[PDB]
Amino acid sequence: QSYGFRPTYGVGHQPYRVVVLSFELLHAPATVCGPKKSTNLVKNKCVNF
Amino acid sequence: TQSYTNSFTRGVYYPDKVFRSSVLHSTQ
């Protein structure tokens, strides 16, 4: 049923465009990642991976 | 046509992407 909007409406009735981001961060091949520079890989030495 | 059968033991996959060895892990 109709969901019309009027500018004269006060708070709590004005339209509220919403975008919700769903994440699935888990042990799986990662495709979306942040802007962190990749460094060279080192073996047989203690590092903060 | 149509007929019935017994599934035996089958239809088991890897629920998760993590790796295990000599582990008796259980999952729901």
mmCIF file with all atom_site columns, N, CA and C in Angstrom:
data_model
loop_
_atom_site.group_PDB
_atom_site.id
_atom_site.type_symbol
_atom_site.label_atom_id
_atom_site.label_alt_id
_atom_site.label_comp_id
_atom_site.label_asym_id
_atom_site.label_entity_id
_atom_site.label_seq_id
_atom_site.pdbx_PDB_ins_code
_atom_site.Cartn_x
_atom_site.Cartn_y
_atom_site.Cartn_z
_atom_site.occupancy
_atom_site.B_iso_or_equiv
_atom_site.pdbx_formal_charge
_atom_site.auth_seq_id
_atom_site.auth_comp_id
_atom_site.auth_asym_id
_atom_site.auth_atom_id
_atom_site.pdbx_PDB_model_num
ATOM 1   N N  . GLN A 1 1  ? 0.843  -1.183  0.000   1.00 0.00 ? 1  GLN A N  1
ATOM 2   C CA . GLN A 1 1  ? 0.000  0.000   0.000   1.00 0.00 ? 1  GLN A CA 1
ATOM 3   C C  . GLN A 1 1  ? 0.883  1.240   0.000   1.00 0.00 ? 1  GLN A C  1
ATOM 4   N N  . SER A 1 2  ? 0.274  2.368   -0.360  1.00 0.00 ? 2  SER A N  1
ATOM 5   C CA . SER A 1 2  ? 1.025  3.575   -0.680  1.00 0.00 ? 2  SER A CA 1
ATOM 6   C C  . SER A 1 2  ? 1.896  4.022   0.489   1.00 0.00 ? 2  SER A C  1
ATOM 7   N N  . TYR A 1 3  ? 3.082  4.517   0.154   1.00 0.00 ? 3  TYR A N  1
ATOM 8   C CA . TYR A 1 3  ? 4.094  4.954   1.109   1.00 0.00 ? 3  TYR A CA 1
ATOM 9   C C  . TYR A 1 3  ? 4.563  6.359   0.758   1.00 0.00 ? 3  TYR A C  1
ATOM 10  N N  . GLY A 1 4  ? 3.600  7.246   0.510   1.00 0.00 ? 4  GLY A N  1
ATOM 11  C CA . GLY A 1 4  ? 3.920  8.578   0.047   1.00 0.00 ? 4  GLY A CA 1
ATOM 12  C C  . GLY A 1 4  ? 4.645  9.408   1.088   1.00 0.00 ? 4  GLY A C  1
ATOM 13  N N  . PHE A 1 5  ? 5.408  10.377  0.591   1.00 0.00 ? 5  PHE A N  1
ATOM 14  C CA . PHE A 1 5  ? 6.218  11.249  1.428   1.00 0.00 ? 5  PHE A CA 1
ATOM 15  C C  . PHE A 1 5  ? 5.876  12.700  1.132   1.00 0.00 ? 5  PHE A C  1
ATOM 16  N N  . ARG A 1 6  ? 5.804  13.509  2.187   1.00 0.00 ? 6  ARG A N  1
ATOM 17  C CA . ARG A 1 6  ? 5.578  14.935  2.049   1.00 0.00 ? 6  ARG A CA 1
ATOM 18  C C  . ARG A 1 6  ? 6.668  15.693  2.794   1.00 0.00 ? 6  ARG A C  1
ATOM 19  N N  . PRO A 1 7  ? 7.184  16.779  2.215   1.00 0.00 ? 7  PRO A N  1
ATOM 20  C CA . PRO A 1 7  ? 8.205  17.566  2.925   1.00 0.00 ? 7  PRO A CA 1
ATOM 21  C C  . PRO A 1 7  ? 7.706  18.150  4.232   1.00 0.00 ? 7  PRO A C  1
ATOM 22  N N  . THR A 1 8  ? 6.398  18.378  4.358   1.00 0.00 ? 8  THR A N  1
ATOM 23  C CA . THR A 1 8  ? 5.847  18.957  5.578   1.00 0.00 ? 8  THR A CA 1
ATOM 24  C C  . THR A 1 8  ? 5.925  18.004  6.765   1.00 0.00 ? 8  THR A C  1
ATOM 25  N N  . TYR A 1 9  ? 6.176  16.719  6.528   1.00 0.00 ? 9  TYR A N  1
ATOM 26  C CA . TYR A 1 9  ? 6.286  15.768  7.626   1.00 0.00 ? 9  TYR A CA 1
ATOM 27  C C  . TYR A 1 9  ? 7.496  16.091  8.492   1.00 0.00 ? 9  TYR A C  1
ATOM 28  N N  . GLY A 1 10 ? 7.362  15.841  9.792   1.00 0.00 ? 10 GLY A N  1
ATOM 29  C CA . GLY A 1 10 ? 8.427  16.085  10.739  1.00 0.00 ? 10 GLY A CA 1
ATOM 30  C C  . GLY A 1 10 ? 9.391  14.919  10.832  1.00 0.00 ? 10 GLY A C  1
ATOM 31  N N  . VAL A 1 11 ? 10.264 14.993  11.840  1.00 0.00 ? 11 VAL A N  1
ATOM 32  C CA . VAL A 1 11 ? 11.228 13.928  12.068  1.00 0.00 ? 11 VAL A CA 1
ATOM 33  C C  . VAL A 1 11 ? 10.486 12.630  12.373  1.00 0.00 ? 11 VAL A C  1
ATOM 34  N N  . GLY A 1 12 ? 11.122 11.505  12.055  1.00 0.00 ? 12 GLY A N  1
ATOM 35  C CA . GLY A 1 12 ? 10.507 10.211  12.243  1.00 0.00 ? 12 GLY A CA 1
ATOM 36  C C  . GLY A 1 12 ? 9.525  9.811   11.167  1.00 0.00 ? 12 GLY A C  1
ATOM 37  N N  . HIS A 1 13 ? 9.223  10.703  10.224  1.00 0.00 ? 13 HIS A N  1
ATOM 38  C CA . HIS A 1 13 ? 8.408  10.374  9.067   1.00 0.00 ? 13 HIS A CA 1
ATOM 39  C C  . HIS A 1 13 ? 9.061  10.765  7.752   1.00 0.00 ? 13 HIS A C  1
ATOM 40  N N  . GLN A 1 14 ? 10.132 11.552  7.782   1.00 0.00 ? 14 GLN A N  1
ATOM 41  C CA . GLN A 1 14 ? 10.865 11.866  6.573   1.00 0.00 ? 14 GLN A CA 1
ATOM 42  C C  . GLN A 1 14 ? 11.544 10.608  6.032   1.00 0.00 ? 14 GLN A C  1
ATOM 43  N N  . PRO A 1 15 ? 11.680 10.494  4.713   1.00 0.00 ? 15 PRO A N  1
ATOM 44  C CA . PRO A 1 15 ? 12.339 9.314   4.144   1.00 0.00 ? 15 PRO A CA 1
ATOM 45  C C  . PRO A 1 15 ? 13.778 9.206   4.618   1.00 0.00 ? 15 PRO A C  1
ATOM 46  N N  . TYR A 1 16 ? 14.207 7.970   4.858   1.00 0.00 ? 16 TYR A N  1
ATOM 47  C CA . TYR A 1 16 ? 15.535 7.684   5.394   1.00 0.00 ? 16 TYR A CA 1
ATOM 48  C C  . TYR A 1 16 ? 16.196 6.647   4.494   1.00 0.00 ? 16 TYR A C  1
ATOM 49  N N  . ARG A 1 17 ? 16.880 7.114   3.453   1.00 0.00 ? 17 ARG A N  1
ATOM 50  C CA . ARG A 1 17 ? 17.610 6.216   2.570   1.00 0.00 ? 17 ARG A CA 1
ATOM 51  C C  . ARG A 1 17 ? 18.664 5.467   3.371   1.00 0.00 ? 17 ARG A C  1
ATOM 52  N N  . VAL A 1 18 ? 18.654 4.142   3.270   1.00 0.00 ? 18 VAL A N  1
ATOM 53  C CA . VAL A 1 18 ? 19.517 3.282   4.067   1.00 0.00 ? 18 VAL A CA 1
ATOM 54  C C  . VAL A 1 18 ? 20.252 2.330   3.140   1.00 0.00 ? 18 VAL A C  1
ATOM 55  N N  . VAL A 1 19 ? 21.560 2.207   3.342   1.00 0.00 ? 19 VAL A N  1
ATOM 56  C CA . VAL A 1 19 ? 22.363 1.160   2.725   1.00 0.00 ? 19 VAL A CA 1
ATOM 57  C C  . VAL A 1 19 ? 23.063 0.392   3.837   1.00 0.00 ? 19 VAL A C  1
ATOM 58  N N  . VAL A 1 20 ? 22.910 -0.928  3.834   1.00 0.00 ? 20 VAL A N  1
ATOM 59  C CA . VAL A 1 20 ? 23.480 -1.788  4.862   1.00 0.00 ? 20 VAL A CA 1
ATOM 60  C C  . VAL A 1 20 ? 24.493 -2.715  4.210   1.00 0.00 ? 20 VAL A C  1
ATOM 61  N N  . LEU A 1 21 ? 25.716 -2.704  4.727   1.00 0.00 ? 21 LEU A N  1
ATOM 62  C CA . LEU A 1 21 ? 26.801 -3.509  4.188   1.00 0.00 ? 21 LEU A CA 1
ATOM 63  C C  . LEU A 1 21 ? 26.914 -4.801  4.983   1.00 0.00 ? 21 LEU A C  1
ATOM 64  N N  . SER A 1 22 ? 26.855 -5.929  4.286   1.00 0.00 ? 22 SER A N  1
ATOM 65  C CA . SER A 1 22 ? 26.957 -7.242  4.905   1.00 0.00 ? 22 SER A CA 1
ATOM 66  C C  . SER A 1 22 ? 28.334 -7.821  4.627   1.00 0.00 ? 22 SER A C  1
ATOM 67  N N  . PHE A 1 23 ? 29.018 -8.248  5.683   1.00 0.00 ? 23 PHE A N  1
ATOM 68  C CA . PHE A 1 23 ? 30.348 -8.821  5.572   1.00 0.00 ? 23 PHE A CA 1
ATOM 69  C C  . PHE A 1 23 ? 30.316 -10.286 5.980   1.00 0.00 ? 23 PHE A C  1
ATOM 70  N N  . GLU A 1 24 ? 31.306 -11.027 5.499   1.00 0.00 ? 24 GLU A N  1
ATOM 71  C CA . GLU A 1 24 ? 31.438 -12.450 5.767   1.00 0.00 ? 24 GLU A CA 1
ATOM 72  C C  . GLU A 1 24 ? 32.874 -12.788 6.127   1.00 0.00 ? 24 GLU A C  1
ATOM 73  N N  . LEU A 1 25 ? 33.513 -11.928 6.920   1.00 0.00 ? 25 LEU A N  1
ATOM 74  C CA . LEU A 1 25 ? 34.922 -12.116 7.243   1.00 0.00 ? 25 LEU A CA 1
ATOM 75  C C  . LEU A 1 25 ? 35.127 -13.465 7.922   1.00 0.00 ? 25 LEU A C  1
ATOM 76  N N  . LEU A 1 26 ? 35.812 -14.367 7.231   1.00 0.00 ? 26 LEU A N  1
ATOM 77  C CA . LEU A 1 26 ? 36.067 -15.698 7.758   1.00 0.00 ? 26 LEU A CA 1
ATOM 78  C C  . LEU A 1 26 ? 37.238 -16.296 6.999   1.00 0.00 ? 26 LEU A C  1
ATOM 79  N N  . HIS A 1 27 ? 37.606 -17.502 7.405   1.00 0.00 ? 27 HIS A N  1
ATOM 80  C CA . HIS A 1 27 ? 38.739 -18.217 6.833   1.00 0.00 ? 27 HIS A CA 1
ATOM 81  C C  . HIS A 1 27 ? 38.349 -18.691 5.442   1.00 0.00 ? 27 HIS A C  1
ATOM 82  N N  . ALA A 1 28 ? 38.615 -17.864 4.439   1.00 0.00 ? 28 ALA A N  1
ATOM 83  C CA . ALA A 1 28 ? 38.178 -18.123 3.075   1.00 0.00 ? 28 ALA A CA 1
ATOM 84  C C  . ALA A 1 28 ? 38.960 -17.207 2.139   1.00 0.00 ? 28 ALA A C  1
ATOM 85  N N  . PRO A 1 29 ? 39.036 -17.555 0.855   1.00 0.00 ? 29 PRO A N  1
ATOM 86  C CA . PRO A 1 29 ? 39.742 -16.695 -0.106  1.00 0.00 ? 29 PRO A CA 1
ATOM 87  C C  . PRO A 1 29 ? 39.217 -15.266 -0.073  1.00 0.00 ? 29 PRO A C  1
ATOM 88  N N  . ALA A 1 30 ? 40.118 -14.329 0.213   1.00 0.00 ? 30 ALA A N  1
ATOM 89  C CA . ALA A 1 30 ? 39.744 -12.931 0.374   1.00 0.00 ? 30 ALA A CA 1
ATOM 90  C C  . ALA A 1 30 ? 39.806 -12.203 -0.963  1.00 0.00 ? 30 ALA A C  1
ATOM 91  N N  . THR A 1 31 ? 38.749 -11.460 -1.276  1.00 0.00 ? 31 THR A N  1
ATOM 92  C CA . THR A 1 31 ? 38.659 -10.698 -2.517  1.00 0.00 ? 31 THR A CA 1
ATOM 93  C C  . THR A 1 31 ? 38.584 -9.196  -2.300  1.00 0.00 ? 31 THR A C  1
ATOM 94  N N  . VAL A 1 32 ? 37.904 -8.744  -1.249  1.00 0.00 ? 32 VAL A N  1
ATOM 95  C CA . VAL A 1 32 ? 37.795 -7.329  -0.917  1.00 0.00 ? 32 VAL A CA 1
ATOM 96  C C  . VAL A 1 32 ? 38.689 -7.054  0.281   1.00 0.00 ? 32 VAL A C  1
ATOM 97  N N  . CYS A 1 33 ? 39.622 -6.118  0.121   1.00 0.00 ? 33 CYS A N  1
ATOM 98  C CA . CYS A 1 33 ? 40.624 -5.856  1.141   1.00 0.00 ? 33 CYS A CA 1
ATOM 99  C C  . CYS A 1 33 ? 40.950 -4.370  1.164   1.00 0.00 ? 33 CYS A C  1
ATOM 100 N N  . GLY A 1 34 ? 41.523 -3.929  2.282   1.00 0.00 ? 34 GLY A N  1
ATOM 101 C CA . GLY A 1 34 ? 41.819 -2.530  2.472   1.00 0.00 ? 34 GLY A CA 1
ATOM 102 C C  . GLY A 1 34 ? 43.124 -2.119  1.828   1.00 0.00 ? 34 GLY A C  1
ATOM 103 N N  . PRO A 1 35 ? 43.418 -0.821  1.917   1.00 0.00 ? 35 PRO A N  1
ATOM 104 C CA . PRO A 1 35 ? 44.633 -0.265  1.294   1.00 0.00 ? 35 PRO A CA 1
ATOM 105 C C  . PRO A 1 35 ? 45.871 -0.417  2.178   1.00 0.00 ? 35 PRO A C  1
ATOM 106 N N  . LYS A 1 36 ? 46.313 -1.658  2.357   1.00 0.00 ? 36 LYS A N  1
ATOM 107 C CA . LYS A 1 36 ? 47.535 -1.958  3.090   1.00 0.00 ? 36 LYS A CA 1
ATOM 108 C C  . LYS A 1 36 ? 48.594 -2.436  2.103   1.00 0.00 ? 36 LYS A C  1
ATOM 109 N N  . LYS A 1 37 ? 49.754 -1.784  2.120   1.00 0.00 ? 37 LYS A N  1
ATOM 110 C CA . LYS A 1 37 ? 50.817 -2.126  1.185   1.00 0.00 ? 37 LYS A CA 1
ATOM 111 C C  . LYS A 1 37 ? 51.393 -3.498  1.511   1.00 0.00 ? 37 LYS A C  1
ATOM 112 N N  . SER A 1 38 ? 51.511 -4.341  0.490   1.00 0.00 ? 38 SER A N  1
ATOM 113 C CA . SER A 1 38 ? 52.090 -5.664  0.661   1.00 0.00 ? 38 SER A CA 1
ATOM 114 C C  . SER A 1 38 ? 53.610 -5.567  0.678   1.00 0.00 ? 38 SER A C  1
ATOM 115 N N  . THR A 1 39 ? 54.235 -6.260  1.624   1.00 0.00 ? 39 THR A N  1
ATOM 116 C CA . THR A 1 39 ? 55.680 -6.269  1.755   1.00 0.00 ? 39 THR A CA 1
ATOM 117 C C  . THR A 1 39 ? 56.245 -7.575  1.205   1.00 0.00 ? 39 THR A C  1
ATOM 118 N N  . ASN A 1 40 ? 57.572 -7.669  1.191   1.00 0.00 ? 40 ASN A N  1
ATOM 119 C CA . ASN A 1 40 ? 58.223 -8.904  0.786   1.00 0.00 ? 40 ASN A CA 1
ATOM 120 C C  . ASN A 1 40 ? 57.994 -9.988  1.833   1.00 0.00 ? 40 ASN A C  1
ATOM 121 N N  . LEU A 1 41 ? 58.050 -11.239 1.387   1.00 0.00 ? 41 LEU A N  1
ATOM 122 C CA . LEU A 1 41 ? 57.795 -12.385 2.247   1.00 0.00 ? 41 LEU A CA 1
ATOM 123 C C  . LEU A 1 41 ? 59.112 -12.917 2.797   1.00 0.00 ? 41 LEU A C  1
ATOM 124 N N  . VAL A 1 42 ? 59.118 -13.251 4.085   1.00 0.00 ? 42 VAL A N  1
ATOM 125 C CA . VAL A 1 42 ? 60.309 -13.733 4.768   1.00 0.00 ? 42 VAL A CA 1
ATOM 126 C C  . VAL A 1 42 ? 59.990 -15.053 5.455   1.00 0.00 ? 42 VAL A C  1
ATOM 127 N N  . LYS A 1 43 ? 60.943 -15.976 5.391   1.00 0.00 ? 43 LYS A N  1
ATOM 128 C CA . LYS A 1 43 ? 60.798 -17.304 5.965   1.00 0.00 ? 43 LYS A CA 1
ATOM 129 C C  . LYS A 1 43 ? 61.832 -17.517 7.063   1.00 0.00 ? 43 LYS A C  1
ATOM 130 N N  . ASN A 1 44 ? 61.501 -18.425 7.982   1.00 0.00 ? 44 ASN A N  1
ATOM 131 C CA . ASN A 1 44 ? 62.415 -18.865 9.036   1.00 0.00 ? 44 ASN A CA 1
ATOM 132 C C  . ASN A 1 44 ? 62.884 -17.706 9.914   1.00 0.00 ? 44 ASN A C  1
ATOM 133 N N  . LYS A 1 45 ? 62.018 -16.717 10.123  1.00 0.00 ? 45 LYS A N  1
ATOM 134 C CA . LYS A 1 45 ? 62.320 -15.602 11.007  1.00 0.00 ? 45 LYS A CA 1
ATOM 135 C C  . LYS A 1 45 ? 61.019 -15.097 11.613  1.00 0.00 ? 45 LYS A C  1
ATOM 136 N N  . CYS A 1 46 ? 61.046 -14.816 12.914  1.00 0.00 ? 46 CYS A N  1
ATOM 137 C CA . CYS A 1 46 ? 59.846 -14.377 13.613  1.00 0.00 ? 46 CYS A CA 1
ATOM 138 C C  . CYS A 1 46 ? 59.408 -13.005 13.119  1.00 0.00 ? 46 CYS A C  1
ATOM 139 N N  . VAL A 1 47 ? 58.139 -12.898 12.718  1.00 0.00 ? 47 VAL A N  1
ATOM 140 C CA . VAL A 1 47 ? 57.581 -11.663 12.176  1.00 0.00 ? 47 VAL A CA 1
ATOM 141 C C  . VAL A 1 47 ? 56.142 -11.521 12.648  1.00 0.00 ? 47 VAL A C  1
ATOM 142 N N  . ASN A 1 48 ? 55.604 -10.312 12.498  1.00 0.00 ? 48 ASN A N  1
ATOM 143 C CA . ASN A 1 48 ? 54.200 -10.029 12.804  1.00 0.00 ? 48 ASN A CA 1
ATOM 144 C C  . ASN A 1 48 ? 53.408 -10.088 11.504  1.00 0.00 ? 48 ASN A C  1
ATOM 145 N N  . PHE A 1 49 ? 52.963 -11.289 11.144  1.00 0.00 ? 49 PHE A N  1
ATOM 146 C CA . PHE A 1 49 ? 52.209 -11.461 9.912   1.00 0.00 ? 49 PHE A CA 1
ATOM 147 C C  . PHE A 1 49 ? 50.813 -10.859 10.038  1.00 0.00 ? 49 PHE A C  1
ATOM 148 N N  . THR B 2 1  ? 9.848  -43.339 -14.667 1.00 0.00 ? 1  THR B N  1
ATOM 149 C CA . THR B 2 1  ? 9.449  -44.159 -13.531 1.00 0.00 ? 1  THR B CA 1
ATOM 150 C C  . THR B 2 1  ? 10.064 -43.632 -12.240 1.00 0.00 ? 1  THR B C  1
ATOM 151 N N  . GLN B 2 2  ? 9.829  -44.344 -11.141 1.00 0.00 ? 2  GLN B N  1
ATOM 152 C CA . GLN B 2 2  ? 10.343 -43.951 -9.838  1.00 0.00 ? 2  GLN B CA 1
ATOM 153 C C  . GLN B 2 2  ? 10.591 -45.198 -9.003  1.00 0.00 ? 2  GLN B C  1
ATOM 154 N N  . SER B 2 3  ? 11.639 -45.156 -8.183  1.00 0.00 ? 3  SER B N  1
ATOM 155 C CA . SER B 2 3  ? 11.977 -46.272 -7.312  1.00 0.00 ? 3  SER B CA 1
ATOM 156 C C  . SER B 2 3  ? 12.768 -45.750 -6.123  1.00 0.00 ? 3  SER B C  1
ATOM 157 N N  . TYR B 2 4  ? 12.882 -46.589 -5.099  1.00 0.00 ? 4  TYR B N  1
ATOM 158 C CA . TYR B 2 4  ? 13.563 -46.238 -3.862  1.00 0.00 ? 4  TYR B CA 1
ATOM 159 C C  . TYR B 2 4  ? 14.874 -47.001 -3.735  1.00 0.00 ? 4  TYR B C  1
ATOM 160 N N  . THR B 2 5  ? 15.733 -46.508 -2.847  1.00 0.00 ? 5  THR B N  1
ATOM 161 C CA . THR B 2 5  ? 17.005 -47.152 -2.551  1.00 0.00 ? 5  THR B CA 1
ATOM 162 C C  . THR B 2 5  ? 17.485 -46.666 -1.192  1.00 0.00 ? 5  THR B C  1
ATOM 163 N N  . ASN B 2 6  ? 18.548 -47.297 -0.703  1.00 0.00 ? 6  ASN B N  1
ATOM 164 C CA . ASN B 2 6  ? 19.140 -46.952 0.581   1.00 0.00 ? 6  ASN B CA 1
ATOM 165 C C  . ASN B 2 6  ? 20.423 -46.167 0.339   1.00 0.00 ? 6  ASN B C  1
ATOM 166 N N  . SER B 2 7  ? 20.517 -44.986 0.955   1.00 0.00 ? 7  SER B N  1
ATOM 167 C CA . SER B 2 7  ? 21.610 -44.061 0.677   1.00 0.00 ? 7  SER B CA 1
ATOM 168 C C  . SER B 2 7  ? 22.959 -44.549 1.184   1.00 0.00 ? 7  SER B C  1
ATOM 169 N N  . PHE B 2 8  ? 22.989 -45.579 2.023   1.00 0.00 ? 8  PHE B N  1
ATOM 170 C CA . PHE B 2 8  ? 24.232 -46.073 2.633   1.00 0.00 ? 8  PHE B CA 1
ATOM 171 C C  . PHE B 2 8  ? 24.861 -44.908 3.401   1.00 0.00 ? 8  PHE B C  1
ATOM 172 N N  . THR B 2 9  ? 26.186 -44.873 3.485   1.00 0.00 ? 9  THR B N  1
ATOM 173 C CA . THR B 2 9  ? 26.906 -43.740 4.061   1.00 0.00 ? 9  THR B CA 1
ATOM 174 C C  . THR B 2 9  ? 27.498 -42.941 2.897   1.00 0.00 ? 9  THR B C  1
ATOM 175 N N  . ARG B 2 10 ? 26.982 -41.720 2.714   1.00 0.00 ? 10 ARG B N  1
ATOM 176 C CA . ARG B 2 10 ? 27.457 -40.840 1.613   1.00 0.00 ? 10 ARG B CA 1
ATOM 177 C C  . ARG B 2 10 ? 26.939 -39.421 1.875   1.00 0.00 ? 10 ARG B C  1
ATOM 178 N N  . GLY B 2 11 ? 27.250 -38.467 0.991   1.00 0.00 ? 11 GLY B N  1
ATOM 179 C CA . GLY B 2 11 ? 26.737 -37.089 1.138   1.00 0.00 ? 11 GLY B CA 1
ATOM 180 C C  . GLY B 2 11 ? 27.420 -36.337 2.267   1.00 0.00 ? 11 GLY B C  1
ATOM 181 N N  . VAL B 2 12 ? 28.738 -36.503 2.415   1.00 0.00 ? 12 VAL B N  1
ATOM 182 C CA . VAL B 2 12 ? 29.484 -35.779 3.437   1.00 0.00 ? 12 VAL B CA 1
ATOM 183 C C  . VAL B 2 12 ? 30.472 -34.860 2.735   1.00 0.00 ? 12 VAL B C  1
ATOM 184 N N  . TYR B 2 13 ? 30.424 -33.577 3.069   1.00 0.00 ? 13 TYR B N  1
ATOM 185 C CA . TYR B 2 13 ? 31.277 -32.567 2.461   1.00 0.00 ? 13 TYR B CA 1
ATOM 186 C C  . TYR B 2 13 ? 32.152 -31.916 3.527   1.00 0.00 ? 13 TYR B C  1
ATOM 187 N N  . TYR B 2 14 ? 32.919 -30.903 3.114   1.00 0.00 ? 14 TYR B N  1
ATOM 188 C CA . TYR B 2 14 ? 33.689 -30.101 4.056   1.00 0.00 ? 14 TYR B CA 1
ATOM 189 C C  . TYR B 2 14 ? 32.857 -28.884 4.439   1.00 0.00 ? 14 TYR B C  1
ATOM 190 N N  . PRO B 2 15 ? 32.328 -28.809 5.662   1.00 0.00 ? 15 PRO B N  1
ATOM 191 C CA . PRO B 2 15 ? 31.560 -27.611 6.053   1.00 0.00 ? 15 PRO B CA 1
ATOM 192 C C  . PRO B 2 15 ? 32.363 -26.324 5.990   1.00 0.00 ? 15 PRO B C  1
ATOM 193 N N  . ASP B 2 16 ? 33.632 -26.368 6.384   1.00 0.00 ? 16 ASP B N  1
ATOM 194 C CA . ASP B 2 16 ? 34.455 -25.181 6.542   1.00 0.00 ? 16 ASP B CA 1
ATOM 195 C C  . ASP B 2 16 ? 35.641 -25.224 5.589   1.00 0.00 ? 16 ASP B C  1
ATOM 196 N N  . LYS B 2 17 ? 36.306 -24.079 5.464   1.00 0.00 ? 17 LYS B N  1
ATOM 197 C CA . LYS B 2 17 ? 37.446 -23.936 4.571   1.00 0.00 ? 17 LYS B CA 1
ATOM 198 C C  . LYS B 2 17 ? 38.780 -24.194 5.260   1.00 0.00 ? 17 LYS B C  1
ATOM 199 N N  . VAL B 2 18 ? 38.780 -24.461 6.555   1.00 0.00 ? 18 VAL B N  1
ATOM 200 C CA . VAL B 2 18 ? 40.012 -24.624 7.315   1.00 0.00 ? 18 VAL B CA 1
ATOM 201 C C  . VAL B 2 18 ? 40.518 -26.052 7.170   1.00 0.00 ? 18 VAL B C  1
ATOM 202 N N  . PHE B 2 19 ? 41.813 -26.235 7.405   1.00 0.00 ? 19 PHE B N  1
ATOM 203 C CA . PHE B 2 19 ? 42.492 -27.501 7.168   1.00 0.00 ? 19 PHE B CA 1
ATOM 204 C C  . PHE B 2 19 ? 42.745 -28.227 8.482   1.00 0.00 ? 19 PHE B C  1
ATOM 205 N N  . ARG B 2 20 ? 42.566 -29.547 8.463   1.00 0.00 ? 20 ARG B N  1
ATOM 206 C CA . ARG B 2 20 ? 42.758 -30.376 9.643   1.00 0.00 ? 20 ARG B CA 1
ATOM 207 C C  . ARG B 2 20 ? 43.523 -31.635 9.263   1.00 0.00 ? 20 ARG B C  1
ATOM 208 N N  . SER B 2 21 ? 44.192 -32.224 10.254  1.00 0.00 ? 21 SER B N  1
ATOM 209 C CA . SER B 2 21 ? 44.926 -33.467 10.059  1.00 0.00 ? 21 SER B CA 1
ATOM 210 C C  . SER B 2 21 ? 44.908 -34.251 11.360  1.00 0.00 ? 21 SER B C  1
ATOM 211 N N  . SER B 2 22 ? 44.464 -35.508 11.286  1.00 0.00 ? 22 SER B N  1
ATOM 212 C CA . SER B 2 22 ? 44.299 -36.365 12.463  1.00 0.00 ? 22 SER B CA 1
ATOM 213 C C  . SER B 2 22 ? 43.451 -35.674 13.527  1.00 0.00 ? 22 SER B C  1
ATOM 214 N N  . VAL B 2 23 ? 42.371 -35.035 13.086  1.00 0.00 ? 23 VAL B N  1
ATOM 215 C CA . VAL B 2 23 ? 41.470 -34.295 13.961  1.00 0.00 ? 23 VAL B CA 1
ATOM 216 C C  . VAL B 2 23 ? 40.091 -34.935 13.888  1.00 0.00 ? 23 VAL B C  1
ATOM 217 N N  . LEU B 2 24 ? 39.468 -35.112 15.050  1.00 0.00 ? 24 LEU B N  1
ATOM 218 C CA . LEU B 2 24 ? 38.140 -35.711 15.153  1.00 0.00 ? 24 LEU B CA 1
ATOM 219 C C  . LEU B 2 24 ? 37.064 -34.644 15.285  1.00 0.00 ? 24 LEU B C  1
ATOM 220 N N  . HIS B 2 25 ? 37.247 -33.518 14.596  1.00 0.00 ? 25 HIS B N  1
ATOM 221 C CA . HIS B 2 25 ? 36.345 -32.382 14.734  1.00 0.00 ? 25 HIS B CA 1
ATOM 222 C C  . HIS B 2 25 ? 34.916 -32.761 14.368  1.00 0.00 ? 25 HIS B C  1
ATOM 223 N N  . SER B 2 26 ? 33.970 -32.264 15.160  1.00 0.00 ? 26 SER B N  1
ATOM 224 C CA . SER B 2 26 ? 32.550 -32.459 14.920  1.00 0.00 ? 26 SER B CA 1
ATOM 225 C C  . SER B 2 26 ? 31.906 -31.123 14.577  1.00 0.00 ? 26 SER B C  1
ATOM 226 N N  . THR B 2 27 ? 30.853 -31.181 13.769  1.00 0.00 ? 27 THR B N  1
ATOM 227 C CA . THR B 2 27 ? 30.168 -29.980 13.316  1.00 0.00 ? 27 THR B CA 1
ATOM 228 C C  . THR B 2 27 ? 28.668 -30.228 13.290  1.00 0.00 ? 27 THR B C  1
ATOM 229 N N  . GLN B 2 28 ? 27.910 -29.137 13.371  1.00 0.00 ? 28 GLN B N  1
ATOM 230 C CA . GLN B 2 28 ? 26.457 -29.167 13.262  1.00 0.00 ? 28 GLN B CA 1
ATOM 231 C C  . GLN B 2 28 ? 26.069 -28.390 12.012  1.00 0.00 ? 28 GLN B C  1
#
